């Protein structure tokens, strides 16, 4: 399962996930590529800010979904 | 940790999992190989139909366990 | 000899006992426009494989095949 993440450089990146891979895991995959620590990460999807504890299933993120990465002020 | 999945073609496939990798994750690994969407997947193990929410630990699936994949009508 | 192919509608194909599954996939392509590569046919729990024939699976007339996509 591969989802999409629009980063801070504009360019979109591709990450391989499991449907139960939580938001904290997704943020960790971003810092393994983008470099921005999860504490300074905010993930938006379909007008909803993703909470760390919840999973991709709870937010109904499916295959090839596009996530928008923004910097947590 | 590698478990076994008897698919719909008869031939058995091999998937690498974690003991906490839930059934929804296992089904996702199948559609990454077999092609059948998780919504149309039913997994049987030791006479028990595996529920999406539960994990491999809850059903006591151990290393080298064989899972039978059937098509959800 | 006609067989049914059901999904999720139901399309009907005019086939031959010696038609390979690859032939069946190509018929659906000429009917619903779906490429054979993204086709996976199942008859009675068993996913049919290209090369083997309808008679090889004892798929008689008026039998119902199930179409699953690999998009
Ligand atoms: Zn994948
Ligand atoms: Zn993961
Ligand atoms: Zn790492
Ligand atoms: Zn892991
Ligand atoms: Zn005929
Ligand atoms: Zn023919
Ligand atoms: Zn049937």
Swiss-Prot record, chain C:
The modification Phosphoserine is found at residue 63. Phosphorylated at Ser-63 by PINK1 during mitophagy. Phosphorylated ubiquitin specifically binds and activates parkin (PRKN), triggering mitophagy. Phosphorylation does not affect E1-mediated E2 charging of ubiquitin but affects discharging of E2 enzymes to form polyubiquitin chains. It also affects deubiquitination by deubiquitinase enzymes such as USP30. There is a cross-link at residues 6, 9, 25, 27, 31, 46, 61 (Glycyl lysine isopeptide (Lys-Gly) (interchain with G-Cter in ubiquitin)). Changing residue 63 to E: Phosphomimetic mutant that binds and activates PRKN. It is a peripheral membrane protein. Residues 1-71 form the Ubiquitin-like domain. The record marks 52, 70 as: Interacts with activating enzyme. Exists either covalently attached to another protein, or free (unanchored). When covalently bound, it is conjugated to target proteins via an isopeptide bond either as a monomer (monoubiquitin), a polymer linked via different Lys residues of the ubiquitin (polyubiquitin chains) or a linear polymer linked via the initiator Met of the ubiquitin (linear polyubiquitin chains). This is Ubiquitin. It comes from Homo sapiens (Human).
